[PDB]
Amino acid sequence: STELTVQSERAFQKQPHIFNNPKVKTSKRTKRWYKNAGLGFKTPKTAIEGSYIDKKCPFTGLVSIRGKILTGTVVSTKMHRTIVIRRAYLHYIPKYNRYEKRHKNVPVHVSPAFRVQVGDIVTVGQCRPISKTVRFNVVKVSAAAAKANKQFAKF
Amino acid sequence: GFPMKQGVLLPTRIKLLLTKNVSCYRPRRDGERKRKSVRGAIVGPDLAVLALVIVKKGEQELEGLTDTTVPKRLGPKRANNIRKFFGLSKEDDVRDFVIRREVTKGEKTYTKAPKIQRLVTPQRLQRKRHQRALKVRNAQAQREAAAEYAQLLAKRLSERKAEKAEI
Amino acid sequence: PRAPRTYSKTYSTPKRPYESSRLDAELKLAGEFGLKNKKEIYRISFQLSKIRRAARDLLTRDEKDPKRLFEGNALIRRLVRVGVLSEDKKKLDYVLALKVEDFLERRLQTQVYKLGLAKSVHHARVLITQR
Amino acid sequence: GISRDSRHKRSATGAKRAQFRKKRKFELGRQPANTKIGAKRIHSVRTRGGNKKYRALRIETGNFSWASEGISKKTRIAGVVYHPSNNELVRTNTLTKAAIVQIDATPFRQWFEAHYGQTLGKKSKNAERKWAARAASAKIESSVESQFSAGRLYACISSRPGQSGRCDGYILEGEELAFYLRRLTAKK
Amino acid sequence: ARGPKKHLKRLAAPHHWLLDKLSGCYAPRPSAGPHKLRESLPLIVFLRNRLKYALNGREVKAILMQRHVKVDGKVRTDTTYPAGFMDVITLDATNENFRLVYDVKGRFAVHRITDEEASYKLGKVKKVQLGKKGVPYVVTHDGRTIRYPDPNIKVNDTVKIDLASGKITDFIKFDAGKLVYVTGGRNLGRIGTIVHKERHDGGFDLVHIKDSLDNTFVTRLNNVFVIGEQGKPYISLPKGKGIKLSIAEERDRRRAQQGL
RNA sequence: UAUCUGGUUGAUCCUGCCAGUAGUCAUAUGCUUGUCUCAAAGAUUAAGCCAUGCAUGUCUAAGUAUAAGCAAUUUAUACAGUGAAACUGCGAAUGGCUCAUUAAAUCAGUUAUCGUUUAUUUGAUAGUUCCUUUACUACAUGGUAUAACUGUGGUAAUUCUAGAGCUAAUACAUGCUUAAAAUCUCGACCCUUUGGAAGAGAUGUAUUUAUUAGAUAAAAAAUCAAUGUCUUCGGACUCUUUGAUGAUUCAUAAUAACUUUUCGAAUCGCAUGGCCUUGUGCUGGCGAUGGUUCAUUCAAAUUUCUGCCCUAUCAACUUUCGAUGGUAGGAUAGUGGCCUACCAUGGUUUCAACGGGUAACGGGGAAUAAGGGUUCGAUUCCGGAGAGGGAGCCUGAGAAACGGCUACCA
RNA sequence: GGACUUUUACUUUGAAAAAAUUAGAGUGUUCAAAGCAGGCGUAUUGCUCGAAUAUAUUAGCAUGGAAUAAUAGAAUAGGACG
RNA sequence: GCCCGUCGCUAGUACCGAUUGAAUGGCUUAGUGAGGCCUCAGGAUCUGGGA
Ligand SMILES: [Mg+2]
Ligand SMILES: [Mg+2]
Ligand SMILES: [Mg+2]
Ligand SMILES: [Mg+2]
Ligand SMILES: [Mg+2]
Ligand SMILES: [Mg+2]
Ligand SMILES: [Mg+2]
Ligand SMILES: [Mg+2]
Ligand SMILES: [Mg+2]
Ligand SMILES: [Mg+2]
Ligand SMILES: [Mg+2]
Ligand SMILES: [Mg+2]
Ligand SMILES: [Mg+2]
Ligand SMILES: [Mg+2]
Ligand SMILES: [Mg+2]
Ligand SMILES: [Mg+2]
Ligand SMILES: [Mg+2]
Ligand SMILES: [Mg+2]
Ligand SMILES: [Mg+2]
Ligand SMILES: [Mg+2]
Ligand SMILES: [Mg+2]
Ligand SMILES: [Mg+2]
Ligand SMILES: [Mg+2]
Ligand SMILES: [Mg+2]
Ligand SMILES: [Mg+2]
Ligand SMILES: [Mg+2]
Ligand SMILES: [Mg+2]
Ligand SMILES: [Mg+2]
Ligand SMILES: [Mg+2]
Ligand SMILES: [Mg+2]
Ligand SMILES: [Mg+2]
Ligand SMILES: [Mg+2]
Ligand SMILES: [Mg+2]
Ligand SMILES: [Mg+2]
Ligand SMILES: [Mg+2]
Structure with missing residues (x-):
C-alpha cells in the first residue's frame, strides 16, 4: 500500500545503515539498498525504482523468504500494506470416498512494490512472524487486474 | 527464646523474610529464604537474656572473667598470616614460626603443625614457568601454521597464473 | 515400564453352539486321537483357519510375485516338514485344501501309537505325560 | 510476572481461549528501565542462560558519532527534545532508542577546529600542511554548523539504554536533520 | 519439561543396537559427544553386546577404567560414550583394532581392521x-x-x-562417480558410486546412487558419505560390500551353505 | 474369516422390532479350583483426605584437615597415611506418579530459525593486562572474614539459633607479566621541494554505537577531490586480491571512539631430570581442575502445511480494559499486539464462525475378522499437563519447581 | 550464468520416515503363549548363521504419465512473433 | 364378535407450579487488596564515593 508522503510518520523513515553523506554531492539524493530474494523471484523494478521504506519488504527490507511457498487468491485488500488470501483445497473423506471443498484465509504482508487487487492469484513466501497473524509475504503477482479495462463504455 | 536482630529498631517481635548471610537464619538450600519471627533490638523486661560485651574494665575484678583467660584455638595457617603474627618480612622463612601442638599418645608425645598455604615453593615456580612457556610456544607454532597456509595460498595463485598462461 | 509380555490365544469356538452334526463330528475325532477337549479340536481348526487365510491371500497375488513366491514357499516347506502336506501336493492350492485330521495325525500322541509302542491312543496319552 | 505468551489474547477469529498451562519463566518479561538523565546509575539484570543485561536508569554521557566526519566523541547528554513514540518521554527527558537529544558540541568543536584549523560559525609546520590538504572538505553544512553557536547539537540515540547500559547515538544530518527541525518548530 | 532428559527407556533405544525387549527396562543413554544420540554406538553396547567381552554393565566400567579401550586414538572412560560411524576403537591388550561402519541391514558391524589403517x-x-x-x-x-x-x-x-x-x-571432492557409503534412511549400509545429483533449491538435494551390481536407489544428500573411487575405497569395507540382496537371494545364500 | 433362528395370523406372504446366537487387553459378581509357564492390578466414583517409615544425595593421586579423631612407622619440624565434621564444587529441572484442566489447544505427520538461549560431552581457540614509558609497580605469588571447632547462652516445642574467641581455599576479594614486526595518528626540526623528517603516542579479547570492505550480469573511456607504488621526471600503473547460501546488512575483517571494563591460571597431583658462568641459578616430564570465543553434542523456545468428538432448542462473532493492521519504542534469549504510545478500521463466518456440551489429555495403538465399516484408547512407548486450589518468585545452564521458598483461600 | 514461465485436481514411482503392537521369515523355548535366540568343533585356550521383510494411506516433499474434470487465452485488438 | 371415551381403585414416570425457591461448577463488573519482583528513598553497622 503506502502511497504518497513516504515521510508520513512521527519517526523519520529510512533503511538502516544505508548512510548518505551530505558532504558528497550525489545525484539521486537517497542511496537505496535492495536484494534478490532467491528462488528465482525477480525483485521487481518498482522496488529498486522505489522510494518507499517498508522494513517487511522481501526485496528492500529486513525479512527473508524461507519455508513454504504457497499460492492463493486475494480476497481482501483493506489492511494498509497487508492482504488476505483464500486457499481452496478438496479434503478427502475416506468412508465416502469423495471430497469436500474447504478453505483457509491467510494473512500476508504486501510490499508497496506490488499493486494487488481483490481477485489476483498471488504467490507468497513464508517469512518470520511479521505480526500477530502474518507469516507470509507477497513475493510475485501471478495475475494483473483480471480484465478490468475490457468492460468500458459503449461504441 | 527468639533472638534479637541488630537494627530492627522496635522493642517487640516481628516476622521477617531473611536471606543468606543474615542473623537468626541459616538457609537449608540455595536461594532459600524463610519468613521467621525475630525479637527487636530494644531491651525490655520480656527478655530472658541480655548479651553484653565488656568494653572497659572496672575498678574491681569480676570473678571468672578478668581473673581467668582462654587461649585462641588455632594459629596462623596462611603464609603471610604467620608472617604478620610475628612480623617477619619476606626473608625469615616461615616453616619454623608455624605453631606446633603437642599431644600425648600414651607414652609417645606428638607434634603436629598446620600446612602453610600460599607458600612460595619450587613446585609452584615450576608451574608458573610452564604456563608462561606454553603461551609463547603455542603462539610461535600458530604463526607457522599461518605461514604454511599463506604459502599454500600464495603458490595456489602461481598455479592459477601459470594455468592462465597455459591456454 | 517394561516391554509388554506379548501373548495371544490359540483357539476359536464355534458360532453355532448346538449343531448336532458338528458335535458328533467333533466327538469322533476326540475318540480317535485321545483328546480330552473340544478345545483340542477348536485349537487346530484355528491353526488351519489362519493357514488357509494366508494361502487364500497369497493366491490372489500374481503367479511368481516375490512375496507369494517367498512366503508361499516358506509355508509349504513348514507344512511338509511335519508331515501334514504330502510330497506330491506341494504347491499351496492343496494347503488350501488340507483337513483337520491331517493335523491330528501328526501329534506325538498318535505317532507314539501308530507304530505300536502303545496299542491304544489313550495308553499313548498316559505314557507321554508320564516321562 | 509480565508474560509474553500469545495464549492470553483472543484468536484471529475472535475466540476466547482456555487457560492452558501456568505461566512459565521462559515467556517472562520485565519492567522498563525508563532511563533518565544524569549521574550514572546502572543495575545488571541476570537474564536467561547465565548472561547479563545492564539496565541504565540515570545516564549523563553517551558516545556520539559525527558520521560524515567519520569520528565519534563522548559528550554530556543535555536533554531530550523529540520522541516519536510518546511525548511524555520528552517532557520527562527519558532516554530510549529513537529519542532525539541535544548533546554538547564542545567535543566536536575542539576536534574540528584542530583538524581543519577553521573554527565553526562566525601555526605549526606539519599542521599547516595537513590543513591545506583538507578544505574543499571543511564545508560543513548550514544546518549543522549553526547548531555549534548554541553549544548544542541535535542527535538520535541509536542504542538501547535499558538493554546495554549505553546511551549512544549519531549527530543528525542532512535529510533526517531536516525532518526533525521541521517537527521541532512545526510543534514549537 | 524443565530440563535435559537423562534416561532412555529400552524400546525408545535405537533399533540398530539390537537390544532385547525384556531383561531390564532402560537402555544406556549416549552421553553428549561427537556423534548424535540416535546414530551412535555407546561403548557399553560395543564392549558387551557385540564383542561379548563384558557380561555385566559393571564389568564394562571395570574394563574401561583400566584404560583398555581407546577411541579414535584417545583413551576415553565414559561407559556410554557416543561412538559412531568412521570412529576407530582399539584394544591394545588383545592387540585388536576396530572401525565402526555399517551393515547392509543398517547396523553397526563388528569389523576388524589392520594396525596401520587403524591410525587414520x-x-x-x-x-x-x-x-x-x-x-x-x-x-x-x-x-x-x-x-x-x-x-x-x-x-x-x-x-x-x-x-x-x-x-x-x-x-575427495563430491563428484559424479565417487565411492559412496549411505549413512541414514532405509538404504543405510548400501554402497555405490553416484550417478547424479538432483538440485532442489530450498530443501533436500537428492543423490542418485548405483552400486556394483547395476542396482539403483536414491537418498537425501545429507545421507551420502563419499569414501573413494569406483573400485578404490579409502577404507576397508565389511563383507557383503554394501550390496544388499533380496530376501530370496539371501535365503538361497544361507541355504546354499548347508552341508556340514 | 460372505450362514442366521423364535415371536404378530385360522392359515399366508410382507414390513418391523423384541428375543436368541458369537467375540471382547472389558469391568463387576456368583459358584468351582490340582499342576507348568506367563503376570495386569485404587484408572472409572472423590486431581477426595492422609497417622508412620522410606523415596536425593554425592570425593578422585589430583580444591580446603592442627578432629584436643584413628593409626603408627618410616626419610619427612610446614603439610604428606586414613579420616568424622564443615567449607567449596556438582546434583536435587532426571526419575517416578497421575489424567484434573485442555476442542485449533494439545497431539500426529510435515516444516522453519536469514528469529533465539543452550550446564555438560567432544574438537578447536588467548606472547598484548602496569605507566608521561631512568632513580618504579609484592610475582620467590598481595587482602580478610568465616564455617566446622572451643566456650558462654535462650525457648514447652522443629533440620530454631544468639553473644564471645579462633583458622583454610579452586569460597570471597584483589592484582603483576612476554618476542619481533608492521600500520596508523601526531609531530621537534629544515626548505621551499616533487616536498622529509628524527621520536612521541596509539593498536589483546569482549562490550556499545557509527562508519567502511565483504567484488563478479560481457566490455571500454574522460573529468573533480583527496593520494597510493615504481621514474629512462614528458609520465606510467603492468601482473593486480578475494569464502558460503536459493536469498542477507551472512561468516570474517578495517576506521573513530565507547565501558561503574568481560576474559587473558595468585590452583592441584604424580614424577624429579637435565644444563654452567656453582647463583639452591636458569631450564624441564606426564595430566588435573579451570578459562574467553567458535564449533559439536544433549537440549529448549517459538514455528509452516494439513488433520479433532456431539451440538443451530448456538448466526453472527471480535475491539470492556488489543479486536485486525501500520510507525516508533519498551520489554524478551530472541520473532510477534508480547506490552505501551500515536494512527487507521480492520479480523472470522452456512466451505458452520462465535457459543454450548464432553461421564475429552493427544498419539503409537485395542476390540470386532468377506469387504466397506463400528466402537474404544485413564493405563508398559512418544508428546503435553499437574502436584489440595490460585498467584508470585529465589537459586540456577535449565523451574514460574512444590519430596524449594513467599502470600492468600481451603 | 542470464533472461521468462497461466493455474489445479487425479495417478505413478520414490525419498523422509521409532520402537513395541500387527502381517510375516528364520530358530525344535521338551510342546505352546513366548523369547531373539542359536548352531557347529579339536567340547584343552574356537569356529560360525542371525537379530529379515511387509504395511506405514491424509497432508508436505521428489519423479514419470497427459486419459478423465476443471482453469487461463485474441473481439472497442491495449493481440502475436522481428 | 370386536370395540371408544368420561367416571372410580392401586402403583410408577415425567411435566406445570407461589416460594424472585435451593445447590454445585466456570467465567466476571465494582470495591477492598496479601505477597514477591522492579523502582524513589532510608541508613542499625562497616569499610574504602562503596557495601
Ligand atoms: Mg487499515
Ligand atoms: Mg595453596
Ligand atoms: Mg519501572
Ligand atoms: Mg549416560
Ligand atoms: Mg535448511
Ligand atoms: Mg404370541
Ligand atoms: Mg397364534
Ligand atoms: Mg378359524
Ligand atoms: Mg440382541
Ligand atoms: Mg482416583
Ligand atoms: Mg492405575
Ligand atoms: Mg459421590
Ligand atoms: Mg593428619
Ligand atoms: Mg518425568
Ligand atoms: Mg570484610
Ligand atoms: Mg571464581
Ligand atoms: Mg570495486
Ligand atoms: Mg565472494
Ligand atoms: Mg555482522
Ligand atoms: Mg634440581
Ligand atoms: Mg438446550
Ligand atoms: Mg506494531
Ligand atoms: Mg471498528
Ligand atoms: Mg452444521
Ligand atoms: Mg477430563
Ligand atoms: Mg478419545
Ligand atoms: Mg493415552
Ligand atoms: Mg478420567
Ligand atoms: Mg511442572
Ligand atoms: Mg489428593
Ligand atoms: Mg479464579
Ligand atoms: Mg509450584
Ligand atoms: Mg519432583
Ligand atoms: Mg506411496
Ligand atoms: Mg520392524
Missing part, C-alpha cells in the same frame, strides 16, 4: 566457515574442527584425518 579416519566435512581472525576452518561429521583446510575443500567432500595428529592428509 575419514570425515565428511559438514561445514566450512571463515573463523575469527580470518582463519578458515572445516568441521567434520564427528565434530572435529580443523583449522586451515585446503581452499578447494567444500561441504560434502570427505576428508582423510591423521588421528595421531589433528591434521588432514587428503580429501
Whole structure:
C-alpha cells in the first residue's frame, strides 16, 4: 500500500545503515539498498525504482523468504500494506470416498512494490512472524487486474 | 527464646523474610529464604537474656572473667598470616614460626603443625614457568601454521597464473 | 515400564453352539486321537483357519510375485516338514485344501501309537505325560 | 510476572481461549528501565542462560558519532527534545532508542577546529600542511554548523539504554536533520 | 519439561543396537559427544553386546577404567560414550583394532581392521566457515574442527584425518562417480558410486546412487558419505560390500551353505 | 474369516422390532479350583483426605584437615597415611506418579530459525593486562572474614539459633607479566621541494554505537577531490586480491571512539631430570581442575502445511480494559499486539464462525475378522499437563519447581 | 550464468520416515503363549548363521504419465512473433 | 364378535407450579487488596564515593 508522503510518520523513515553523506554531492539524493530474494523471484523494478521504506519488504527490507511457498487468491485488500488470501483445497473423506471443498484465509504482508487487487492469484513466501497473524509475504503477482479495462463504455 | 536482630529498631517481635548471610537464619538450600519471627533490638523486661560485651574494665575484678583467660584455638595457617603474627618480612622463612601442638599418645608425645598455604615453593615456580612457556610456544607454532597456509595460498595463485598462461 | 509380555490365544469356538452334526463330528475325532477337549479340536481348526487365510491371500497375488513366491514357499516347506502336506501336493492350492485330521495325525500322541509302542491312543496319552 | 505468551489474547477469529498451562519463566518479561538523565546509575539484570543485561536508569554521557566526519566523541547528554513514540518521554527527558537529544558540541568543536584549523560559525609546520590538504572538505553544512553557536547539537540515540547500559547515538544530518527541525518548530 | 532428559527407556533405544525387549527396562543413554544420540554406538553396547567381552554393565566400567579401550586414538572412560560411524576403537591388550561402519541391514558391524589403517579416519566435512581472525576452518561429521583446510575443500567432500595428529592428509571432492557409503534412511549400509545429483533449491538435494551390481536407489544428500573411487575405497569395507540382496537371494545364500 | 433362528395370523406372504446366537487387553459378581509357564492390578466414583517409615544425595593421586579423631612407622619440624565434621564444587529441572484442566489447544505427520538461549560431552581457540614509558609497580605469588571447632547462652516445642574467641581455599576479594614486526595518528626540526623528517603516542579479547570492505550480469573511456607504488621526471600503473547460501546488512575483517571494563591460571597431583658462568641459578616430564570465543553434542523456545468428538432448542462473532493492521519504542534469549504510545478500521463466518456440551489429555495403538465399516484408547512407548486450589518468585545452564521458598483461600 | 514461465485436481514411482503392537521369515523355548535366540568343533585356550521383510494411506516433499474434470487465452485488438 | 371415551381403585414416570425457591461448577463488573519482583528513598553497622 503506502502511497504518497513516504515521510508520513512521527519517526523519520529510512533503511538502516544505508548512510548518505551530505558532504558528497550525489545525484539521486537517497542511496537505496535492495536484494534478490532467491528462488528465482525477480525483485521487481518498482522496488529498486522505489522510494518507499517498508522494513517487511522481501526485496528492500529486513525479512527473508524461507519455508513454504504457497499460492492463493486475494480476497481482501483493506489492511494498509497487508492482504488476505483464500486457499481452496478438496479434503478427502475416506468412508465416502469423495471430497469436500474447504478453505483457509491467510494473512500476508504486501510490499508497496506490488499493486494487488481483490481477485489476483498471488504467490507468497513464508517469512518470520511479521505480526500477530502474518507469516507470509507477497513475493510475485501471478495475475494483473483480471480484465478490468475490457468492460468500458459503449461504441 | 527468639533472638534479637541488630537494627530492627522496635522493642517487640516481628516476622521477617531473611536471606543468606543474615542473623537468626541459616538457609537449608540455595536461594532459600524463610519468613521467621525475630525479637527487636530494644531491651525490655520480656527478655530472658541480655548479651553484653565488656568494653572497659572496672575498678574491681569480676570473678571468672578478668581473673581467668582462654587461649585462641588455632594459629596462623596462611603464609603471610604467620608472617604478620610475628612480623617477619619476606626473608625469615616461615616453616619454623608455624605453631606446633603437642599431644600425648600414651607414652609417645606428638607434634603436629598446620600446612602453610600460599607458600612460595619450587613446585609452584615450576608451574608458573610452564604456563608462561606454553603461551609463547603455542603462539610461535600458530604463526607457522599461518605461514604454511599463506604459502599454500600464495603458490595456489602461481598455479592459477601459470594455468592462465597455459591456454 | 517394561516391554509388554506379548501373548495371544490359540483357539476359536464355534458360532453355532448346538449343531448336532458338528458335535458328533467333533466327538469322533476326540475318540480317535485321545483328546480330552473340544478345545483340542477348536485349537487346530484355528491353526488351519489362519493357514488357509494366508494361502487364500497369497493366491490372489500374481503367479511368481516375490512375496507369494517367498512366503508361499516358506509355508509349504513348514507344512511338509511335519508331515501334514504330502510330497506330491506341494504347491499351496492343496494347503488350501488340507483337513483337520491331517493335523491330528501328526501329534506325538498318535505317532507314539501308530507304530505300536502303545496299542491304544489313550495308553499313548498316559505314557507321554508320564516321562 | 509480565508474560509474553500469545495464549492470553483472543484468536484471529475472535475466540476466547482456555487457560492452558501456568505461566512459565521462559515467556517472562520485565519492567522498563525508563532511563533518565544524569549521574550514572546502572543495575545488571541476570537474564536467561547465565548472561547479563545492564539496565541504565540515570545516564549523563553517551558516545556520539559525527558520521560524515567519520569520528565519534563522548559528550554530556543535555536533554531530550523529540520522541516519536510518546511525548511524555520528552517532557520527562527519558532516554530510549529513537529519542532525539541535544548533546554538547564542545567535543566536536575542539576536534574540528584542530583538524581543519577553521573554527565553526562566525601555526605549526606539519599542521599547516595537513590543513591545506583538507578544505574543499571543511564545508560543513548550514544546518549543522549553526547548531555549534548554541553549544548544542541535535542527535538520535541509536542504542538501547535499558538493554546495554549505553546511551549512544549519531549527530543528525542532512535529510533526517531536516525532518526533525521541521517537527521541532512545526510543534514549537 | 524443565530440563535435559537423562534416561532412555529400552524400546525408545535405537533399533540398530539390537537390544532385547525384556531383561531390564532402560537402555544406556549416549552421553553428549561427537556423534548424535540416535546414530551412535555407546561403548557399553560395543564392549558387551557385540564383542561379548563384558557380561555385566559393571564389568564394562571395570574394563574401561583400566584404560583398555581407546577411541579414535584417545583413551576415553565414559561407559556410554557416543561412538559412531568412521570412529576407530582399539584394544591394545588383545592387540585388536576396530572401525565402526555399517551393515547392509543398517547396523553397526563388528569389523576388524589392520594396525596401520587403524591410525587414520575419514570425515565428511559438514561445514566450512571463515573463523575469527580470518582463519578458515572445516568441521567434520564427528565434530572435529580443523583449522586451515585446503581452499578447494567444500561441504560434502570427505576428508582423510591423521588421528595421531589433528591434521588432514587428503580429501575427495563430491563428484559424479565417487565411492559412496549411505549413512541414514532405509538404504543405510548400501554402497555405490553416484550417478547424479538432483538440485532442489530450498530443501533436500537428492543423490542418485548405483552400486556394483547395476542396482539403483536414491537418498537425501545429507545421507551420502563419499569414501573413494569406483573400485578404490579409502577404507576397508565389511563383507557383503554394501550390496544388499533380496530376501530370496539371501535365503538361497544361507541355504546354499548347508552341508556340514 | 460372505450362514442366521423364535415371536404378530385360522392359515399366508410382507414390513418391523423384541428375543436368541458369537467375540471382547472389558469391568463387576456368583459358584468351582490340582499342576507348568506367563503376570495386569485404587484408572472409572472423590486431581477426595492422609497417622508412620522410606523415596536425593554425592570425593578422585589430583580444591580446603592442627578432629584436643584413628593409626603408627618410616626419610619427612610446614603439610604428606586414613579420616568424622564443615567449607567449596556438582546434583536435587532426571526419575517416578497421575489424567484434573485442555476442542485449533494439545497431539500426529510435515516444516522453519536469514528469529533465539543452550550446564555438560567432544574438537578447536588467548606472547598484548602496569605507566608521561631512568632513580618504579609484592610475582620467590598481595587482602580478610568465616564455617566446622572451643566456650558462654535462650525457648514447652522443629533440620530454631544468639553473644564471645579462633583458622583454610579452586569460597570471597584483589592484582603483576612476554618476542619481533608492521600500520596508523601526531609531530621537534629544515626548505621551499616533487616536498622529509628524527621520536612521541596509539593498536589483546569482549562490550556499545557509527562508519567502511565483504567484488563478479560481457566490455571500454574522460573529468573533480583527496593520494597510493615504481621514474629512462614528458609520465606510467603492468601482473593486480578475494569464502558460503536459493536469498542477507551472512561468516570474517578495517576506521573513530565507547565501558561503574568481560576474559587473558595468585590452583592441584604424580614424577624429579637435565644444563654452567656453582647463583639452591636458569631450564624441564606426564595430566588435573579451570578459562574467553567458535564449533559439536544433549537440549529448549517459538514455528509452516494439513488433520479433532456431539451440538443451530448456538448466526453472527471480535475491539470492556488489543479486536485486525501500520510507525516508533519498551520489554524478551530472541520473532510477534508480547506490552505501551500515536494512527487507521480492520479480523472470522452456512466451505458452520462465535457459543454450548464432553461421564475429552493427544498419539503409537485395542476390540470386532468377506469387504466397506463400528466402537474404544485413564493405563508398559512418544508428546503435553499437574502436584489440595490460585498467584508470585529465589537459586540456577535449565523451574514460574512444590519430596524449594513467599502470600492468600481451603 | 542470464533472461521468462497461466493455474489445479487425479495417478505413478520414490525419498523422509521409532520402537513395541500387527502381517510375516528364520530358530525344535521338551510342546505352546513366548523369547531373539542359536548352531557347529579339536567340547584343552574356537569356529560360525542371525537379530529379515511387509504395511506405514491424509497432508508436505521428489519423479514419470497427459486419459478423465476443471482453469487461463485474441473481439472497442491495449493481440502475436522481428 | 370386536370395540371408544368420561367416571372410580392401586402403583410408577415425567411435566406445570407461589416460594424472585435451593445447590454445585466456570467465567466476571465494582470495591477492598496479601505477597514477591522492579523502582524513589532510608541508613542499625562497616569499610574504602562503596557495601
Ligand atoms: Mg487499515
Ligand atoms: Mg595453596
Ligand atoms: Mg519501572
Ligand atoms: Mg549416560
Ligand atoms: Mg535448511
Ligand atoms: Mg404370541
Ligand atoms: Mg397364534
Ligand atoms: Mg378359524
Ligand atoms: Mg440382541
Ligand atoms: Mg482416583
Ligand atoms: Mg492405575
Ligand atoms: Mg459421590
Ligand atoms: Mg593428619
Ligand atoms: Mg518425568
Ligand atoms: Mg570484610
Ligand atoms: Mg571464581
Ligand atoms: Mg570495486
Ligand atoms: Mg565472494
Ligand atoms: Mg555482522
Ligand atoms: Mg634440581
Ligand atoms: Mg438446550
Ligand atoms: Mg506494531
Ligand atoms: Mg471498528
Ligand atoms: Mg452444521
Ligand atoms: Mg477430563
Ligand atoms: Mg478419545
Ligand atoms: Mg493415552
Ligand atoms: Mg478420567
Ligand atoms: Mg511442572
Ligand atoms: Mg489428593
Ligand atoms: Mg479464579
Ligand atoms: Mg509450584
Ligand atoms: Mg519432583
Ligand atoms: Mg506411496
Ligand atoms: Mg520392524
